[PDB]
Amino acid sequence: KVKVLGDVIEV
Amino acid sequence: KVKVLGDVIEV
Amino acid sequence: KVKVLGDVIEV
Amino acid sequence: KVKVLGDVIEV
Amino acid sequence: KVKVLGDVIEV
Amino acid sequence: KVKVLGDVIEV
DSSP, rough: EEEEEEEEEOO | OOOEEEEEEEE | OEEEEEEEOOO | EEEEEEEEEEE | EEEEEEEEEOO | EEEEEEEEEOO
């Protein structure tokens, strides 16, 4: 399964 | 910290 | 198209 | 609630 | 490399 | 604004 792991940033 | 967990979906 | 649907959590 | 919507991009 | 670029929304 | 940056991972 293709999962996603990510971060939140302010741009 | 804020982390993103998710799925890839074909659309 | 590969799209992403995810959640934000605190880790 | 906070939900993430996005795209997969080849990099 | 498959990267992800996305947005956070309230649902 | 809040933007998500991340990776696709095989799980």
